[PDB]
């Protein structure tokens, strides 16, 4: 059996190290990788370390451990909520902006704490651990999880045992995402995780610096999937104790807060060396305490946080645009973009909340549709730099003609992107209404629905802007500034 896992992981490492076989066969590659991972998983015994008690049986030890090290432990309790899972619930009225939660650095798991642990020797030798702090945190979790006397045991024993990241999806649940933007990141996540597991499985067996690790005796795919999912759904960027650099950290107790819409109210206090959270809003006794995770899209929430957020005012879709080398005005357009700090080709974003395009995308689209005369005015003369400075400003167009052209292009491109999906918006709503689905299936279908709804709104907003600027052109309105 040990030699059989070596053969399967070696086969997995080679299949996952191969280049992409073209986007037309990425689903076949995904299923091929799934088959080998599931064969390895069926031959392994799941998580190497499991705890006898229930998850809530260890929360009192988390509170005692956090209290002994200076963290806030009063005013809230752990509750298993249906929608979000476990989270914090207020036991007293908490006013907005009240500093109610603080976690000193001594409780955190960091890349620095990983470097000084039993993972130290292997960390100083493996180039992937040195370059990827998130992967370093994942192995930091695993090594301490398998260490019964670890300082962070109260935190690890209260972590979830499974997640709703796409790594846990069934094949037919991912299949809903066919022909979407997000599935390619799902493909990459699965392939990367499989390649990393096979890579480190071989590294741990061949490197003498890993002999003292518990992973030397047991390191299953389930371990790695749980570790990277624990990190991607919970990790944070904090300043170093010096304050001159940034590092990645797991923040116990505080990271039990679930997400709602708002503003980030959690910051690191460098003078007291602790993470501080003020109340995002008023929380009455008996209400769940929420925080705002960040301005991430539902694609990022699903893939990296394992949930879909219905009230995501920061949702967005990607749109790749670039000046064609076949364009007669390519050189001038690329130079105007260069002077504006914009690459010639890039992946932009289309947002659901108006305005649909950012200042950087507006500036790109303006230059993309400029005439030679307009490009010259942004390249030559004492006003050229002033014209560059306003390229991202909606109130200062290059010309009414330039606006009509760019909004017509965006309307056509967004409408073309909508035609590349295998289902329509009405079909997705019918599936959600008429079929009984798992949580993970609903995440996938809502994700593909959300992509098209953002594209549909971009079509409507671009069509509206096209008519507005066409009116200014027909009425010969004076250009602003």
């Amino acid at each position: 059996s040990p030699k059989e896992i070596l053969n399967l992981t070696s086969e997995l490492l080679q299949k996952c190290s191969s280049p992409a076989p073209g986007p037309g066969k990425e689903w076949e590659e995904y299923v091929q990788i799934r088959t080998l991972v599931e064969k390895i998983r069926k031959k392994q015994k799941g998580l190497s370390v499991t705890f006898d008690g229930k998850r809530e049986d260890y929360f009192p030890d988390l509170m005692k451990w956090a209290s002994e090290n200076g963290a806030s432990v009063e005013g809230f309790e752990m509750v298993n909520f249906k929608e979000e899972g476990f989270g914090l619930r207020a036991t007293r009225d908490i006013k907005a902006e009240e500093l109610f939660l603080w976690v000193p650095r001594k409780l955190l798991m960091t890349v620095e704490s990983a470097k000084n642990s039993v993972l130290g020797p292997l960390y100083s030798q493996d180039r992937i651990l040195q370059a990827m702090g998130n992967i370093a945190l994942a192995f930091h979790l695993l090594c301490e999880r398998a260490s019964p006397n670890s300082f962070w045991q109260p935190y690890i024993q209260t972590l979830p045992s499974e997640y709703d990241t796409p790594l846990y999806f069934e094949e037919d649940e991912v299949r809903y995402l066919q022909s979407t933007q997000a599935i390619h990141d799902v493909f990459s996540q699965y392939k990367n995780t499989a390649r990393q597991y096979a890579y480190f499985y071989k590294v741990i067996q061949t490197h003498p610096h890993a002999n003292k690790l518990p992973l030397k005796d047991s390191f299953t795919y389930e371990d790695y999937r749980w570790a990277v999912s624990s990190v991607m759904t919970r990790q944070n960027q904090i300043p170093t104790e010096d304050g001159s650099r940034v590092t990645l950290a797991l923040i116990p107790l505080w990271d039990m807060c679930n997400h709602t819409n708002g503003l980030i109210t959690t910051g690191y206090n460098l003078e007291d060396d602790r993470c501080e959270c003020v109340a995002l809003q008023d929380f009455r006794a008996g209400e769940q305490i929420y925080i705002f995770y960040g301005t991430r899209s539902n694609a990022e929430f699903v893939i990296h946080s394992g949930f879909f957020f219905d009230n995501n005012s920061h949702d967005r879709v990607k749109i790749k645009l670039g000046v064609s080398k076949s364009d007669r005005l390519y050189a001038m357009k690329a130079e105007v973009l260069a002077r504006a700090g914009i690459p010639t080709s890039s992946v932009f974003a289309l947002h659901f909340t108006e305005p649909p395009i950012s200042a950087q995308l507006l500036a790109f689209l303006r230059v993309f549709c400029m005439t030679e005369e307009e490009l010259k005015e942004h390249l030559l003369g004492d006003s050229a730099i002033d014209r560059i400075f306003t390229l991202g400003n909606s109130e200062f167009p290059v010309s009414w003609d330039n606006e009509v052209k760019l909004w017509t292009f965006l309307e056509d491109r967004a409408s073309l992107l909508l035609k590349t999906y295998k289902t329509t918006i009405e079909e997705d709503k019918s599936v959600l209404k008429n079929h009984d689905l798992s949580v993970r299936a609903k995440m996938a279908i809502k994700l593909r629905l959300g992509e098209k709804e953002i594209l549909e709104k971009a079509v409507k907003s671009a069509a509206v802007n096209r008519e507005y600027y066409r009116q200014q052109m027909e009425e010969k309105a004076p250009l602003p500034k």
Partner: peptide, 15 residues
């Protein structure tokens, strides 16, 4: 504003 805002589950590169 917050000198060091903390983003819960900040997205990192795994490639």
């Amino acid at each position: 504003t917050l000198k060091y805002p903390i983003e819960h589950g900040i997205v990192t590169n795994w490639d």
